[PDB]
Structures are given as C-alpha cells and as structure tokens.
Write a protein that binds this ligand. Sequence first.
Ligand SMILES: OCc1ccn(-c2ccc(Nc3cc4nc(OC5CCNCC5)ccc4cn3)c(F)c2)n1
Length: 291
Amino acid sequence: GAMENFQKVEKIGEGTYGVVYKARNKLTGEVVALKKIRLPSTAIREISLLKELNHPNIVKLLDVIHTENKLYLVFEFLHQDLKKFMDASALTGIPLPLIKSYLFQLLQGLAFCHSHRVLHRDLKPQNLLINTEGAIKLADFGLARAFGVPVRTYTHEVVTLWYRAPEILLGCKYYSTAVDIWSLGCIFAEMVTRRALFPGDSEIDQLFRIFRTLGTPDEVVWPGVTSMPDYKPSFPKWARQDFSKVVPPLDEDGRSLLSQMLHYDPNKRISAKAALAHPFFQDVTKPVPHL
Ligand SMILES: OCc1ccn(-c2ccc(Nc3cc4nc(OC5CCNCC5)ccc4cn3)c(F)c2)n1
C-alpha cells in the first residue's frame, strides 16, 4: 500500500490523536516525522487545507495520506521540543536573547496563521519544535478545528490545562485568535522563570490559579464576564498581583508585553501582529542554542 514507501526509524512520541515516528521516505530519501491517527469527511478536508498553510515558523505538513481506516500526516523532522530544552536548561536558564528570539519567531508564526483565520487552540512547550540553527516552529497547528481538543489523549494521558485561556475555561464556545496569545504568554513566563505560570490540575484549579495572580475578573476589566456559561458569582474575589513578583528578573518591556498577552478580555489582549511591533523586540537577534 501507501505506507510501504516509509521505513520506520524510531518512535518520537505520543500526540493528542496518534503516535509519531521518525521515518525515511524510500522514494525521495527524505527524513520525516510521521503521525499515524486511527480513524470523518469534514476532518479530511480541513486537514488537507493545512498543506497550503506554509510559513518558516510552522512545522511543514508535507503530505496527508488517508488509507486503511487511518490518517497519516507527514511532517518535516526537527531536532527536539522546547520542553526538553527547558528541562535541560533548568540549572542555568535559557538566555534572555534566545527567549526573545524564540518569542519573536513564534509571534510571526501566529501572525501568519491568524491572518488566514486558523487557530492552534492547544499551544504548549511540546508543540514548539527547535533546530540547532536557532529556529523554532509551531507543531499541530489547525488540528484542533479538525478533531476538537479532548479531555484525554489516544493513550488516556491528561491533556494539559496549563496554557488554556480563561474564556475557554468559562465556557465560551466561539474561540478567537486571542486564545493562542494567552497560551504563548504563559509559555513566555515559563521560559523566563523556569516554572509553569499556572500549573492547574482541574478546570477550577486552573481558573483559581489564574485569578490568584491576575485578580478575579469582573465587569470593569472584562465586560460580559459575569454572564459567561461557567461563571459563578460564588468565585472568591482575589486581588491582582504586581508583575514584578510574577516574572522576575524580566525587564519592564518584557513585563509590559506579557501583561498585554494576559489581558482577561480577548478583545483587549494584544494581537500577534501588534506584539511583533512591541519595544521588547527592538534589540532582537537570532542566537545559536546549546543543544
Ligand atoms: O523526551 C525528549 C525527547 C525524546 C524524543 N524527542 C524528540 C525527537 C524528535 C523530535 N522531532 C520532531 C517531532 C515532531 N512531533 C510532531 O508531533 C507531535 C508534537 C507535539 N504534540 C504531539 C504531536 C510533529 C512533527 C515533529 C517533527 N520533529 C522531537 F520533537 C522530540 N524528545
């Protein structure tokens, strides 16, 4: 069949929807990352369109193969993920110029996809892939619109809530591009501090962690919040903390940017385009990482 063209080399990992292998294309000679999803007509159309969603900071979708009750997604191969790099950099920290380069690149990736009205909806360090040159790329872009974001993965692993926007947690059915800015803000904070910003272990724990740092949202900061489906007037009313406490020793340009990425109101939250123009990026460079 179709899959006799790919030689499996090694197992990379386990995604939300299926297993990912390093593989060799026998006809072209290319080394690829092959995602195998066990199987929907609408999903096939939506995923096939992602072959056109091409940008240097988006993991290249080389092909989509629907065969034998399975969907194979053939991706470009990269060295490792940001999670491994952050774990490896725990003692010393990722240098600020490299954090800045990576955030700048990821914002370009978001600005591109958002310009075509495609959301990621499940950004997290495991979906950010790096090479030895200094590039970083977003993996799994567009798969959430095709399949949804489940509670558990295909292996029953808990899908993390740590990067989930508060509008999603409060039960908004209609997600804007702002949900990805929220997630990337949380990732930015984690790179700087070497600890997850909001490591919640349930929906309410996630919400209350957000509230304990940013203040419990009300009608002043977020018009309509008190009418949202999963909003309860019984939520405790926590005061907002200073960003100087949350992400030390990050400078005022970095804190300004982060604060705008974590605005409660999706309509007030900074866009990817606007974030690229932020003064934080005035001295941005492209360093080569220690991998
Ligand atoms: O524990 C440390 C360790 C062990 C092995 N590695 C590791 C080896 C190779 C790669 N390269 C890679 C992986 C990809 N993965 C994709 O999909 C998954 C992304 C996350 N969400 C689920 C789907 C898509 C395209 C990919 C392209 N290259 C790597 F990233 C890590 N790291």
